[PDB]
Tab-separated table of C-alpha atoms in Angstrom:
chain	number	residue	atom	x	y	z
A	19	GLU	CA	0.000	0.000	0.000
A	20	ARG	CA	1.279	3.453	-0.879
A	21	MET	CA	-0.062	6.475	0.956
A	22	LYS	CA	0.280	10.256	0.696
A	23	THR	CA	1.318	12.389	3.660
A	24	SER	CA	0.416	15.907	4.828
A	25	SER	CA	2.502	18.926	5.911
A	26	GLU	CA	-0.714	20.452	7.417
A	27	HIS	CA	-2.348	17.737	9.552
A	28	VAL	CA	-0.643	14.817	11.371
A	29	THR	CA	-3.031	11.787	11.196
A	30	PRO	CA	-3.918	10.848	14.806
A	31	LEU	CA	-2.859	7.420	16.091
A	32	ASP	CA	-5.844	5.095	16.183
A	33	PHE	CA	-4.873	1.733	17.745
A	34	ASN	CA	-8.336	0.199	17.694
A	35	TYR	CA	-9.857	-2.483	15.519
A	36	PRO	CA	-13.593	-3.060	16.133
A	37	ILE	CA	-14.370	-6.675	17.196
A	38	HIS	CA	-17.913	-8.133	16.817
A	39	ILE	CA	-18.205	-11.392	18.793
A	40	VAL	CA	-21.351	-12.394	20.716
A	41	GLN	CA	-20.584	-13.025	24.421
A	42	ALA	CA	-20.370	-16.816	24.779
A	43	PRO	CA	-21.102	-18.542	28.116
A	44	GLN	CA	-18.280	-19.006	30.650
A	45	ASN	CA	-16.301	-22.167	29.861
A	46	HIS	CA	-14.249	-22.047	33.116
A	47	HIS	CA	-10.915	-22.429	31.217
A	48	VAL	CA	-8.188	-19.897	31.876
A	49	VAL	CA	-5.679	-18.767	29.256
A	50	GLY	CA	-2.438	-16.775	29.780
A	51	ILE	CA	-1.064	-14.029	27.557
A	52	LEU	CA	2.646	-13.166	27.818
A	53	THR	CA	3.863	-9.577	27.439
A	54	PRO	CA	4.668	-9.320	23.721
A	55	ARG	CA	8.288	-8.996	22.640
A	56	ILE	CA	8.182	-6.798	19.516
A	57	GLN	CA	11.631	-5.359	18.727
A	58	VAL	CA	11.360	-2.131	16.818
A	59	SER	CA	13.444	0.500	15.009
A	60	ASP	CA	14.476	3.597	17.033
A	61	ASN	CA	11.838	5.821	15.334
A	62	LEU	CA	9.151	3.433	16.746
A	63	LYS	CA	10.374	3.407	20.362
A	64	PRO	CA	8.077	6.338	21.387
A	65	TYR	CA	5.038	4.370	20.057
A	66	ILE	CA	5.633	0.676	20.747
A	67	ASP	CA	4.246	0.616	24.305
A	68	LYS	CA	0.962	2.232	23.162
A	69	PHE	CA	0.838	-0.225	20.235
A	70	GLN	CA	1.532	-3.375	22.312
A	71	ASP	CA	-0.791	-2.323	25.168
A	72	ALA	CA	-3.721	-1.848	22.731
A	73	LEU	CA	-3.070	-5.148	20.943
A	74	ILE	CA	-2.934	-7.113	24.217
A	75	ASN	CA	-6.071	-5.395	25.532
A	76	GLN	CA	-7.984	-6.241	22.343
A	77	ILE	CA	-6.709	-9.874	22.141
A	78	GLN	CA	-7.736	-10.307	25.835
A	79	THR	CA	-11.283	-9.218	24.837
A	80	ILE	CA	-11.408	-11.835	22.012
A	81	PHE	CA	-10.740	-14.645	24.515
A	82	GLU	CA	-13.177	-13.157	27.073
A	83	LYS	CA	-15.970	-12.822	24.466
A	84	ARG	CA	-15.344	-16.451	23.540
A	85	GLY	CA	-15.853	-17.423	27.236
A	86	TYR	CA	-12.285	-17.824	28.623
A	87	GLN	CA	-10.795	-16.162	31.605
A	88	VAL	CA	-7.519	-14.395	30.846
A	89	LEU	CA	-4.405	-13.862	32.938
A	90	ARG	CA	-1.324	-11.886	32.000
A	91	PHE	CA	2.264	-13.006	32.609
A	92	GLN	CA	5.629	-11.252	32.178
A	93	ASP	CA	7.214	-14.229	30.368
A	94	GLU	CA	7.302	-18.030	30.197
A	95	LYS	CA	9.381	-18.153	33.416
A	96	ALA	CA	6.735	-16.149	35.351
A	97	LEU	CA	4.482	-19.235	35.118
A	98	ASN	CA	5.249	-21.300	38.225
A	99	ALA	CA	4.693	-25.103	38.244
A	100	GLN	CA	1.138	-24.801	39.580
A	101	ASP	CA	0.243	-22.071	37.008
A	102	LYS	CA	1.379	-24.352	34.170
A	103	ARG	CA	-0.821	-27.201	35.479
A	104	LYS	CA	-3.857	-24.968	35.716
A	105	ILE	CA	-3.643	-22.762	32.612
A	106	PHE	CA	-5.331	-24.203	29.471
A	107	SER	CA	-2.766	-22.679	27.043
A	108	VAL	CA	-0.702	-19.514	26.634
A	109	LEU	CA	-0.459	-16.992	23.767
A	110	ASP	CA	3.059	-15.658	22.981
A	111	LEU	CA	3.641	-12.820	20.420
A	112	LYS	CA	7.107	-12.002	19.013
A	113	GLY	CA	7.971	-9.551	16.251
A	114	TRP	CA	10.597	-7.598	14.358
A	115	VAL	CA	8.977	-4.378	13.143
A	116	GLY	CA	10.665	-1.361	11.641
A	117	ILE	CA	10.188	1.716	9.458
A	118	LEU	CA	13.070	2.671	7.174
A	119	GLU	CA	13.179	6.425	6.524
A	120	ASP	CA	14.152	8.644	3.574
A	121	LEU	CA	14.261	6.033	0.814
A	122	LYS	CA	14.275	7.522	-2.720
A	123	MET	CA	12.197	5.650	-5.319
A	124	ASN	CA	10.929	6.253	-8.855
A	125	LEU	CA	7.161	6.299	-8.743
A	126	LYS	CA	6.905	3.732	-11.585
A	127	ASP	CA	4.180	5.789	-13.348
A	128	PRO	CA	4.722	5.149	-17.049
A	129	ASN	CA	2.628	8.217	-17.831
A	130	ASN	CA	4.796	10.311	-15.466
A	131	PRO	CA	8.359	9.044	-15.717
A	132	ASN	CA	9.886	12.219	-14.104
A	133	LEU	CA	8.177	11.700	-10.760
A	134	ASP	CA	10.357	10.401	-7.931
A	135	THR	CA	9.554	10.218	-4.263
A	136	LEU	CA	11.070	10.214	-0.814
A	137	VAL	CA	9.339	7.449	1.242
A	138	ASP	CA	9.178	5.786	4.662
A	139	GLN	CA	8.827	2.005	4.171
A	140	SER	CA	7.696	-0.578	6.787
A	141	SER	CA	9.628	-3.843	7.179
A	142	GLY	CA	9.263	-7.085	9.220
A	143	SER	CA	6.661	-9.397	10.694
A	144	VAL	CA	4.930	-10.623	13.891
A	145	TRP	CA	4.514	-14.242	14.974
A	146	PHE	CA	1.830	-15.687	17.284
A	147	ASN	CA	1.708	-19.063	18.930
A	148	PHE	CA	-0.856	-20.514	21.338
A	149	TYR	CA	0.721	-23.457	23.250
A	150	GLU	CA	0.065	-25.708	26.212
A	151	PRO	CA	2.895	-24.877	28.696
A	152	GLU	CA	3.358	-28.336	30.337
A	153	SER	CA	3.658	-30.335	27.092
A	154	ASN	CA	4.640	-27.612	24.527
A	155	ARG	CA	1.782	-28.799	22.338
A	156	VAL	CA	1.271	-26.044	19.722
A	157	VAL	CA	-2.503	-25.530	19.677
A	158	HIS	CA	-2.410	-22.819	16.984
A	159	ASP	CA	0.327	-20.623	15.398
A	160	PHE	CA	0.074	-17.913	12.754
A	161	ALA	CA	1.967	-14.878	11.528
A	162	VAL	CA	1.520	-11.603	9.756
A	163	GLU	CA	3.791	-9.700	7.386
A	164	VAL	CA	3.854	-5.937	8.135
A	165	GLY	CA	6.568	-4.807	5.624
A	166	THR	CA	3.981	-3.831	2.962
A	167	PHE	CA	3.283	-0.155	3.705
A	168	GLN	CA	4.942	2.860	2.124
A	169	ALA	CA	4.181	6.550	2.969
A	170	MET	CA	5.408	9.225	0.522
A	171	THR	CA	7.025	11.972	2.533
A	172	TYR	CA	8.019	14.206	-0.405
A	173	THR	CA	7.210	13.714	-4.127
A	174	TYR	CA	9.277	15.559	-6.734
A	175	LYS	CA	9.237	16.086	-10.477
A	176	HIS	CA	12.292	16.591	-12.650
A	177	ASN	CA	12.233	19.149	-15.497
A	178	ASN	CA	11.956	17.621	-18.978
A	179	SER	CA	15.557	18.750	-19.560
A	180	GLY	CA	16.943	17.232	-16.302
A	181	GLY	CA	19.146	19.379	-14.080
A	182	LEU	CA	17.980	21.107	-10.870
A	183	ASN	CA	14.669	22.783	-10.218
A	184	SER	CA	12.599	23.844	-7.202
A	185	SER	CA	10.852	20.455	-6.837
A	186	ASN	CA	13.904	18.193	-6.803
A	187	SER	CA	15.711	20.265	-4.121
A	188	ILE	CA	14.986	18.046	-1.085
A	189	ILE	CA	15.064	20.089	2.115
A	190	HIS	CA	14.458	17.872	5.162
A	191	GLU	CA	14.163	20.977	7.373
A	192	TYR	CA	10.684	21.473	5.838
A	193	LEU	CA	9.507	17.852	6.132
A	194	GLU	CA	9.093	17.272	9.947
A	195	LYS	CA	5.243	17.042	9.743
A	196	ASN	CA	5.216	14.821	6.634
A	197	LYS	CA	7.586	12.444	8.439
A	198	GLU	CA	5.495	12.353	11.631
A	199	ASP	CA	2.401	11.780	9.466
A	200	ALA	CA	4.195	8.913	7.654
A	201	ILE	CA	5.018	7.099	10.944
A	202	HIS	CA	1.467	7.555	12.300
A	203	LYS	CA	-0.246	6.296	9.095
A	204	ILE	CA	2.072	3.269	8.820
A	205	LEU	CA	1.539	2.416	12.526
A	206	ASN	CA	-2.293	2.614	11.984
A	207	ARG	CA	-2.111	0.276	8.999
A	208	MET	CA	0.213	-2.163	10.816
A	209	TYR	CA	-2.162	-2.225	13.821
A	210	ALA	CA	-5.203	-2.971	11.629
A	211	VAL	CA	-3.533	-5.803	9.711
A	212	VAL	CA	-2.193	-7.458	12.933
A	213	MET	CA	-5.604	-7.220	14.606
A	214	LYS	CA	-7.463	-8.468	11.494
A	215	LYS	CA	-5.147	-11.485	11.534
A	216	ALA	CA	-5.742	-12.089	15.274
A	217	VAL	CA	-9.563	-11.928	14.841
A	218	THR	CA	-9.428	-14.253	11.816
A	219	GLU	CA	-7.271	-16.895	13.601
A	220	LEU	CA	-8.430	-16.793	17.251
A	221	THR	CA	-11.624	-18.641	16.624
A	222	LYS	CA	-13.469	-21.073	18.895
A	223	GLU	CA	-12.347	-24.000	16.618
A	224	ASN	CA	-8.587	-23.092	16.711
A	225	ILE	CA	-8.552	-22.220	20.435
A	226	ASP	CA	-10.243	-25.541	21.258
A	227	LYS	CA	-8.215	-27.627	18.804
A	228	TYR	CA	-6.826	-29.976	21.510
A	229	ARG	CA	-9.421	-29.322	24.271
A	230	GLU	CA	-10.175	-32.987	25.144
A	231	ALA	CA	-6.554	-34.130	25.349
A	232	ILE	CA	-5.500	-31.036	27.291
A	233	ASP	CA	-8.385	-31.338	29.771
A	234	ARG	CA	-7.662	-35.109	30.229
A	235	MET	CA	-3.949	-34.417	30.954
A	236	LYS	CA	-4.752	-31.598	33.406
A	237	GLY	CA	-7.613	-33.391	35.243
A	238	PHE	CA	-10.167	-30.740	34.219
A	239	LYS	CA	-13.376	-32.745	34.768
B	19	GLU	CA	12.228	-22.149	2.950
B	20	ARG	CA	12.426	-24.511	5.902
B	21	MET	CA	15.740	-26.075	6.835
B	22	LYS	CA	16.975	-28.691	9.308
B	23	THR	CA	19.791	-27.976	11.751
B	24	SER	CA	22.592	-30.091	13.247
B	25	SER	CA	23.826	-30.656	16.824
B	26	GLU	CA	27.056	-32.172	15.338
B	27	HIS	CA	28.323	-29.727	12.688
B	28	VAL	CA	27.814	-25.925	12.545
B	29	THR	CA	27.429	-24.944	8.830
B	30	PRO	CA	30.299	-22.539	8.002
B	31	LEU	CA	29.427	-18.973	6.980
B	32	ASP	CA	29.810	-18.571	3.236
B	33	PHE	CA	29.225	-14.924	2.216
B	34	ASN	CA	30.032	-15.352	-1.460
B	35	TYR	CA	27.822	-15.427	-4.519
B	36	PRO	CA	29.680	-16.237	-7.768
B	37	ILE	CA	29.344	-13.446	-10.393
B	38	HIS	CA	29.956	-14.153	-14.128
B	39	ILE	CA	30.289	-10.864	-16.046
B	40	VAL	CA	32.759	-10.362	-18.917
B	41	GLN	CA	35.121	-7.419	-18.232
B	42	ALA	CA	33.720	-4.504	-20.254
B	43	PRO	CA	35.975	-1.653	-21.456
B	44	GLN	CA	36.586	1.349	-19.171
B	45	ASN	CA	33.774	3.894	-19.551
B	46	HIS	CA	35.539	6.594	-17.450
B	47	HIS	CA	32.426	7.139	-15.242
B	48	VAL	CA	32.841	6.929	-11.492
B	49	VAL	CA	30.143	5.659	-9.137
B	50	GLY	CA	30.002	5.958	-5.311
B	51	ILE	CA	28.790	3.331	-2.861
B	52	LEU	CA	27.762	4.450	0.641
B	53	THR	CA	28.444	2.265	3.685
B	54	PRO	CA	25.237	0.233	4.031
B	55	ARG	CA	22.949	0.893	6.983
B	56	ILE	CA	21.425	-2.509	7.819
B	57	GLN	CA	19.914	-2.517	11.327
B	58	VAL	CA	19.863	-5.982	12.785
B	59	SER	CA	18.627	-7.987	15.784
B	60	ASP	CA	21.100	-8.493	18.679
B	61	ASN	CA	21.816	-12.137	17.680
B	62	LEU	CA	23.098	-10.789	14.296
B	63	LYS	CA	25.447	-8.123	15.692
B	64	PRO	CA	28.488	-10.504	15.710
B	65	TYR	CA	27.908	-11.210	11.963
B	66	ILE	CA	26.649	-8.007	10.342
B	67	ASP	CA	30.062	-6.449	9.627
B	68	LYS	CA	31.245	-9.618	7.820
B	69	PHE	CA	27.928	-9.703	5.920
B	70	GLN	CA	27.963	-6.015	4.865
B	71	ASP	CA	31.686	-6.033	3.976
B	72	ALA	CA	31.203	-9.030	1.623
B	73	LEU	CA	28.107	-7.536	-0.020
B	74	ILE	CA	29.836	-4.192	-0.676
B	75	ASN	CA	32.961	-5.921	-2.009
B	76	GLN	CA	30.884	-8.023	-4.419
B	77	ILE	CA	28.645	-5.101	-5.569
B	78	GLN	CA	31.855	-3.056	-6.200
B	79	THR	CA	33.045	-5.886	-8.510
B	80	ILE	CA	29.743	-5.801	-10.493
B	81	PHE	CA	30.272	-2.107	-11.316
B	82	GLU	CA	33.991	-2.648	-12.077
B	83	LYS	CA	33.253	-5.592	-14.423
B	84	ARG	CA	30.719	-3.373	-16.175
B	85	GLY	CA	33.480	-0.737	-16.710
B	86	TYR	CA	32.881	1.858	-13.932
B	87	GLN	CA	35.319	3.099	-11.403
B	88	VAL	CA	34.044	2.810	-7.835
B	89	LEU	CA	34.597	4.986	-4.783
B	90	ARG	CA	33.351	4.366	-1.270
B	91	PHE	CA	31.819	7.006	1.007
B	92	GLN	CA	30.762	6.957	4.676
B	93	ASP	CA	27.382	8.609	3.967
B	94	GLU	CA	25.610	11.164	1.775
B	95	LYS	CA	27.232	14.022	3.750
B	96	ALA	CA	30.760	12.670	3.052
B	97	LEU	CA	30.247	13.713	-0.596
B	98	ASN	CA	31.529	17.291	-0.828
B	99	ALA	CA	30.185	19.690	-3.513
B	100	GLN	CA	32.911	18.776	-6.012
B	101	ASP	CA	32.391	15.000	-5.426
B	102	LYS	CA	28.676	15.376	-6.206
B	103	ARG	CA	29.472	17.187	-9.485
B	104	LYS	CA	31.908	14.511	-10.563
B	105	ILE	CA	30.265	11.249	-9.465
B	106	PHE	CA	27.879	9.680	-12.041
B	107	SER	CA	25.476	8.275	-9.386
B	108	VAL	CA	25.591	6.720	-5.920
B	109	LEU	CA	24.257	3.392	-4.582
B	110	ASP	CA	22.674	3.489	-1.081
B	111	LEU	CA	21.572	0.266	0.750
B	112	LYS	CA	19.299	0.329	3.830
B	113	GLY	CA	17.752	-2.627	5.634
B	114	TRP	CA	15.929	-3.986	8.654
B	115	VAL	CA	17.012	-7.603	9.115
B	116	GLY	CA	16.354	-9.859	12.063
B	117	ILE	CA	16.110	-13.469	13.234
B	118	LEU	CA	13.446	-14.262	15.824
B	119	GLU	CA	14.458	-17.188	18.048
B	120	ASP	CA	12.617	-20.049	19.778
B	121	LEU	CA	9.268	-19.831	17.993
B	122	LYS	CA	7.066	-22.937	18.458
B	123	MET	CA	5.100	-24.053	15.382
B	124	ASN	CA	3.077	-27.088	14.300
B	125	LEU	CA	4.810	-28.638	11.332
B	126	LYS	CA	1.571	-28.654	9.271
B	127	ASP	CA	2.202	-32.257	8.097
B	128	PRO	CA	-1.254	-33.772	7.707
B	129	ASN	CA	0.314	-37.228	7.750
B	130	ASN	CA	2.148	-36.365	11.002
B	131	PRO	CA	-0.121	-34.141	13.068
B	132	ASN	CA	1.843	-34.736	16.355
B	133	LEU	CA	5.032	-33.124	15.087
B	134	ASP	CA	5.805	-29.643	16.401
B	135	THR	CA	9.003	-27.690	16.093
B	136	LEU	CA	11.102	-25.015	17.716
B	137	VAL	CA	12.326	-22.624	14.950
B	138	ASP	CA	14.428	-19.529	14.252
B	139	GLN	CA	12.597	-17.360	11.682
B	140	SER	CA	14.087	-14.511	9.570
B	141	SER	CA	12.194	-11.216	9.233
B	142	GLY	CA	12.618	-7.932	7.275
B	143	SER	CA	13.944	-6.562	4.010
B	144	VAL	CA	16.727	-4.559	2.290
B	145	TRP	CA	16.250	-1.600	-0.048
B	146	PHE	CA	18.643	-0.370	-2.765
B	147	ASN	CA	18.590	2.877	-4.657
B	148	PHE	CA	21.008	4.220	-7.270
B	149	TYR	CA	20.617	8.040	-7.517
B	150	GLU	CA	22.319	11.063	-9.012
B	151	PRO	CA	23.432	13.146	-5.964
B	152	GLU	CA	23.088	16.693	-7.438
B	153	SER	CA	19.527	16.282	-8.768
B	154	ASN	CA	18.201	13.305	-6.685
B	155	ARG	CA	17.186	11.630	-9.931
B	156	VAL	CA	16.476	7.973	-9.028
B	157	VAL	CA	18.283	6.005	-11.744
B	158	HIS	CA	17.232	2.587	-10.394
B	159	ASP	CA	15.709	1.288	-7.104
B	160	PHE	CA	14.848	-2.246	-6.025
B	161	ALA	CA	14.329	-4.266	-2.871
B	162	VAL	CA	14.483	-7.757	-1.508
B	163	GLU	CA	12.413	-9.511	1.142
B	164	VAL	CA	14.565	-11.637	3.503
B	165	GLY	CA	11.867	-12.757	6.034
B	166	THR	CA	11.266	-16.087	4.224
B	167	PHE	CA	13.706	-18.476	5.925
B	168	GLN	CA	12.996	-20.789	8.838
B	169	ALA	CA	15.550	-23.155	10.510
B	170	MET	CA	14.193	-25.927	12.773
B	171	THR	CA	16.256	-25.954	15.926
B	172	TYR	CA	14.422	-28.809	17.684
B	173	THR	CA	11.591	-31.006	16.301
B	174	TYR	CA	9.395	-32.946	18.726
B	175	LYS	CA	6.645	-35.535	18.555
B	176	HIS	CA	3.806	-35.880	21.030
B	177	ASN	CA	2.634	-39.348	22.150
B	178	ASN	CA	-0.668	-40.465	20.609
B	179	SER	CA	-2.210	-40.072	24.080
B	180	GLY	CA	-0.844	-36.522	24.683
B	181	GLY	CA	0.883	-35.764	27.976
B	182	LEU	CA	4.675	-35.551	28.450
B	183	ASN	CA	7.327	-37.714	26.874
B	184	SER	CA	11.073	-37.536	26.210
B	185	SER	CA	10.693	-35.720	22.859
B	186	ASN	CA	8.453	-32.857	23.966
B	187	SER	CA	10.687	-31.944	26.953
B	188	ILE	CA	12.490	-28.928	25.431
B	189	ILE	CA	15.871	-28.415	27.084
B	190	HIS	CA	17.633	-25.345	25.658
B	191	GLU	CA	20.830	-26.304	27.520
B	192	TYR	CA	21.313	-29.015	24.850
B	193	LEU	CA	20.532	-26.840	21.809
B	194	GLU	CA	23.513	-24.364	21.596
B	195	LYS	CA	24.912	-25.944	18.362
B	196	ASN	CA	21.509	-26.259	16.656
B	197	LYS	CA	20.929	-22.559	17.363
B	198	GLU	CA	24.340	-21.492	16.024
B	199	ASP	CA	23.704	-23.675	12.955
B	200	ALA	CA	20.278	-22.014	12.478
B	201	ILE	CA	21.787	-18.476	12.461
B	202	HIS	CA	24.593	-19.483	10.058
B	203	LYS	CA	22.242	-21.227	7.562
B	204	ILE	CA	19.751	-18.328	7.594
B	205	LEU	CA	22.581	-15.778	7.111
B	206	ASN	CA	23.883	-17.845	4.102
B	207	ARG	CA	20.438	-17.918	2.510
B	208	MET	CA	19.862	-14.187	3.144
B	209	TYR	CA	23.259	-13.371	1.573
B	210	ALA	CA	22.506	-15.428	-1.559
B	211	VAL	CA	19.064	-13.906	-2.127
B	212	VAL	CA	20.363	-10.300	-1.646
B	213	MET	CA	23.269	-10.912	-4.027
B	214	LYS	CA	21.061	-12.669	-6.622
B	215	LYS	CA	18.826	-9.592	-6.548
B	216	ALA	CA	21.814	-7.219	-6.930
B	217	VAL	CA	23.183	-9.192	-9.937
B	218	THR	CA	19.732	-9.318	-11.565
B	219	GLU	CA	19.117	-5.536	-11.187
B	220	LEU	CA	22.574	-3.941	-11.613
B	221	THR	CA	22.673	-4.379	-15.329
B	222	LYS	CA	24.258	-2.139	-17.963
B	223	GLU	CA	20.725	-0.993	-19.069
B	224	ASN	CA	19.561	0.017	-15.520
B	225	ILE	CA	22.887	1.627	-14.529
B	226	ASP	CA	22.876	3.691	-17.740
B	227	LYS	CA	19.165	4.534	-17.646
B	228	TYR	CA	19.740	8.333	-17.598
B	229	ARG	CA	23.338	8.420	-18.952
B	230	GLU	CA	22.818	11.145	-21.610
B	231	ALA	CA	20.941	13.577	-19.370
B	232	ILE	CA	23.338	13.032	-16.469
B	233	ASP	CA	26.435	13.491	-18.653
B	234	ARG	CA	24.903	16.664	-20.245
B	235	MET	CA	24.173	18.176	-16.784
B	236	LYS	CA	27.662	17.341	-15.468
B	237	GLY	CA	29.607	18.459	-18.589
B	238	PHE	CA	31.005	14.953	-19.188
B	239	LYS	CA	31.983	15.310	-22.867
């Protein structure tokens, strides 16, 4: 996806993906969610906590709507021996997520071959697995690519004769808002595609894939 | 691509991609190559200098075989005003390249549904552009995805009845060699796909895309 940016208005962050699941009855199973470990580029460090916190809050609501109780844990090691015996399964999220800045590209418009652009470009991916902590049975695993978003920070057009002109003078000192807008729009897209994935994969059928065997092993009667 | 690993033999690093280009005559143009800026995950920090150094050395030989002289520069700012007037165009490489460790996945074998695996998984991408530094004319740009490689560090098989068994006890204290092997094999694959890309795109026709206009602007007679 390729998106324009603005020097006038910075697009607000909007880390929310509407979920429409009818409240199921309580199934008395408890699931754990570990703090995600998404490593990010330096430009994303001011945002990643807001991003992760929203994601975890929304994923928690998927499980709750489907009738599970949900507990949060720092990491795998935070589950003591009794926790592991009791918990149905645990969701772990890991990721490598970055935005590369100030890339110059030709726009690839055959009708406009003199148009080039300065872009920010996303890169990386996030990986989910839902596993039973005693046995390491993988109940469900899935992933999402997030390196598919490009925001044009500055578009320029060469003169028919080549050489220098007002457009192709790139002055970063005038682009601060475009560049903030780029990061915000990419973040909003990356949030939506991760959450769409989560909603699509965290279904009753996938969550319950090994319910009988897990409940037998754990003595859940 | 999904690859096995070994606890016996760590696959040597092999950052070399054979290039077969007949030495063209000297064209008296000079190109610049900037030090690449590939940001990597912490597990790749011991390797990235070796990786980048090899890539740059091989890309330099592509341009030289095609008849260009090649100069190296620290960054865009290292090109003084006279350098920018003289240099034909400059190649910049940026990337976001990581390996996520210890992911648990079901193997997706319908004939073997009890087989799960611990994997290292690559993630990210690298972005090339070749641009004329005075005008910012993008001569050629291209990119390569590198998040497509998975190395199985430990494969395990659940008993038909579920529960615990010798296989599904995951003991990281025994996996040091498998994990070193994983990183080395992924790095070798990522090198080969980046270099294949570079060879495919850094052709005489793409390098010379704006030769006349650039030479006219610069007074190259």
